Design a protein around this nucleic acid. Structure first.
Lengths: 81, 113, 78, 56, 133, 95
RNA sequence: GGAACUCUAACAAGACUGCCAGUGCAAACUGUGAGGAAGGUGGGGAUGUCAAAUCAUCACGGCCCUUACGCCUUGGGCUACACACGUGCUACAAUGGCCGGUACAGAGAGCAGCCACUGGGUGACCAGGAGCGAAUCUAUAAAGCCGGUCACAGUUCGGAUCGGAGUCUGCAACUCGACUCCGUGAAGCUGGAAUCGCUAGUAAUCGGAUAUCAGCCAUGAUCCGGUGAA
RNA sequence: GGAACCUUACCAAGGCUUAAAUGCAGACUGCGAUUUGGAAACAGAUCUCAGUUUACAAGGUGCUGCAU
């Protein structure tokens, strides 16, 4: 969750912006090995915390719980059935 | 009869008795029987000698014997005598397919030393 | 990599082709142990990084199916 | 009135009865089970449901 | 402090329209399978047709009904109804030790009226000993 | 005469020879216990829902409503977190 | 082509021991009748010391390093293995296995995709190619039923181990992925004191879905549906 | 509640010091493809919001949940 480690994700995301037509055209691949979609781990996008992630809200479980409790996500309620 | 070297069906069903031969199994035995043309439900103690020979001819097609036994033996000896990871693993007697040599490795290691 | 095309590193292949063309020379140093042994690698000596050092391997003929990392043990148990 | 959707059962209804001047279509209810404590108390979760209502 | 009981009412079976057959197949069930238990019971009672009907089975179910149980190891009567649950449980438990082929085959112990009366005899012999309590 | 069965999950709409979903009484209830549970003594049912026993109990409830009438309120209990099933927990030690 | 039903989702009724019997100044229990229901209908969210877990979700008082205990990379380790305790799955069999016929769902997901259909291949899968950003289109349940076999043992039960040949993802499958396929049948024939869960759609058993998503260890976790006890 | 790289915080070895990201402070103007050394990071050329000095911060999944 360090600043360097969370900025590494942004650097890799900015690196995988080009080469979108190069990787689309088992050989002929001399790349910086960072322009691949297999190295993009998803963070919490506020704190930058791995080990728990929801694609819908894009944040970790602890931030999701705290915001859903203190009314920051429209729609969430207390599930009961 | 003795389809393979010394194996004996001895009144069992065709497939269940022919799968007793080392090298040949359920699938290839069923394939052999379907290509030679004998019912699988009938027993072995009543097969005619013509059917016996017709099945022998097609069982002598696959490498199913001590020959294949020692073929895979030379395979493991080849991968062993060159210094491979699988070679040293076979030499020392621990699981080779990437299983955890921690707990649940008894069938490969042995009893409690 | 799995019968859709043999996988050998570009740099490794380029540096061993010139060696096999010039004949017999010094050991070839590498880190990419993920390369598969090629019939162009026979009779050659490779110092491959293992975890901290470089273990040598002499490709005679028989490892042509195995990878360049099947040798060079990584963990030292006893 | 063609399909309109919201996240509350009393706001989209007022919007739709406003449109009808100026059909249920069952709601979509998602559910999440989130661990409560930030450190190990694993046998203590919390369920959070998200409704999505849509009508026309 | 259980304070109540409900006895879990039952419903009869199509064949023999009897209420004891339902209890028997309920004690016979395994992993929640009633159809195969009914099938096994029907095959067993049809195999028993060698020698009458399920009457002989229900009368053999009587010889396994104890009248006093030990539970300082004091004897006491069980209940007017738990007798026909101990009898069924003992029959079904000791019919699974017979080294026959199928379940319907090894269930042919109703004619042994054979590891079922032995339990009642041992219970009576152990209850008549501690009669001074 | 119309009737609604409404067992555990099955729903049968009895429309009172005993035909079921354009089929016969044997292609839908082969078992003896399935042919039973019709203890009432031009019938369409249009059943849809749970299992065979559930549908049988539903058509029984409907044929009892058109004349057993007690609708069984039993439903599948919800699985609760921290457990393995609805009413069974895990296994612990040192207690 | 229809507005009666199921259904969906908004509003209402219905359970208040209220009705009828006995006890009691009173609350209140013990039974019956009506009813879909009973006596908080059932299940959940609600939760009024141990200097207990986290300075690794986050913030922060104090101390320490800043040619660095800070920072970008490649390779490796987190999978190491003589042993142990805990949590799980499967099998130890014929109310069972196998080849066949025949049915019955629910919820949830789908352009970070679901795939109808056709052609190649035993198979995983590949090529072509509709429909669908969702009561519209796709994703084909098992147990169960009927018929034949096996007729009892390390077996036509069992599934670990190992060799060879392939498919998918990804720059990369040896350390360390999954699946298919042809070989093979190790320990296991109800487990010692001791200990665990469960009072009704419960336990037991069978199947399906979701979450992290390039793939995946998934037998873990969260749910749903079927059969169903003492 | 997804360890092949990535996650990764650990280890061995190559490359950095006002910083691999963010505010600032004072100048000098209007992203891409090609080529060499390489395991990459990074260095040296063509070419057409970005690039470079000086003093500033910065940073740590570093230690104590018995300061919070």
């Amino acid at each position: 969750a360090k600043e360097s480690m969370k900025a590494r994700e942004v650097k890799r995301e900015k690196t995988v912006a080009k080469y979108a037509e190069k990787r689309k055209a088992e050989g002929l691949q001399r790349l910086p090995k960072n322009a691949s979609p297999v190295r993009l781990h998803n963070r919490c996008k506020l704190t930058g915390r791995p080990r728990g992630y929801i694609r819908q809200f894009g944040i970790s479980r602890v931030t999701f719980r705290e915001m859903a409790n203190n009314g920051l996500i429209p729609g969430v309620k207390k599930a009961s059935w | 009869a003795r389809i393979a070297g010394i194996n004996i069906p001895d009144h069992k069903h065709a497939v269940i008795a022919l799968t007793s031969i080392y090298g040949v199994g359920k699938t290839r035995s069923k394939a052999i029987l379907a290509a030679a043309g004998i019912a699988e439900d009938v027993k072995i103690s009543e097969l005619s000698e013509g059917q016996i020979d017709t099945l022998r001819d097609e069982v002598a097609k696959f490498v199913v014997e001590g020959d294949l036994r020692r073929e895979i033996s030379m395979s493991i000896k080849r991968l062993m005598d060159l210094g491979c990871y699988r070679g040293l693993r076979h030499r020392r007697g621990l699981p080779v397919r990437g299983q955890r040599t921690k707990t649940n490795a008894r069938t490969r290691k042995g009893p409690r030393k | 990599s799995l019968k859709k095309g043999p996988f050998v590193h570009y740099k490794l292949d380029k540096k061993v082709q010139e060696n096999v063309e010039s004949g017999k020379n010094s050991v070839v140093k590498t880190w990419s142990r993920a390369s598969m042994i090629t019939p162009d690698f026979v009779g050659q000596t490779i110092a491959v990084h293992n975890g901290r050092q470089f273990v040598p391997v002499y490709v005679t003929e028989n490892m042509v199916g195995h990878k360049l990392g099947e040798f060079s043990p990584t963990r030292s148990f006893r | 009135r063609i399909k309109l959707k919201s996240y509350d059962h009393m706001l989209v209804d007022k919007s739709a009865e406003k449109i009808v001047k100026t059909i249920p279509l069952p709601t979509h209810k998602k559910l999440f089970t989130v661990l409560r404590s930030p450190h190990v108390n694993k046998k203590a979760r919390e369920q959070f449901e998200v409704m999505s209502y849509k009508r026309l | 402090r259980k304070r109540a009981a409900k006895k879990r009412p039952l419903l009869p079976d199509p064949r023999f329209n009897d209420q004891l057959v339902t209890r028997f197949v309920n004690n016979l069930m395994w992993d929640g399978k009633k159809s195969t238990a009914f099938k096994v019971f029907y095959d067993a009672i049809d195999i028993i047709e060698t020698k009458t009907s399920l009457e002989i089975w229900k009368d053999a179910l009587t010889n396994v009904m104890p009248h006093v149980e030990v539970r300082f190891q004091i004897p006491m009567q069980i209940r007017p109804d738990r007798k026909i649950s101990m009898a069924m449980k003992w029959l079904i438990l000791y019919a699974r030790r017979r080294n026959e082929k199928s379940m319907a085959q090894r269930l042919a112990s109703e004619c042994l009226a054979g590891a079922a009366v032995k339990k009642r005899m041992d219970t009576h012999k152990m209850a008549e000993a501690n009669k001074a309590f | 005469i119309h009737k609604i069965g409404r067992r555990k999950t099955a729903v049968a709409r009895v429309y009172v020879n005993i035909t079921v979903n354009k089929k016969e009484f044997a292609t839908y209830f082969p078992t003896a216990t399935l042919q039973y549970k019709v203890l009432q003594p031009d019938v369409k049912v249009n059943v849809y829902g749970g299992g065979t026993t559930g549908q049988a109990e539903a058509v029984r409830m409907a044929l009892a409503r058109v004349m057993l009438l007690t609708r069984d309120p039993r439903m599948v209990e919800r699985k609760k977190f921290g457990q393995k099933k609805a009413r069974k927990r895990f296994q612990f030690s040192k207690r």
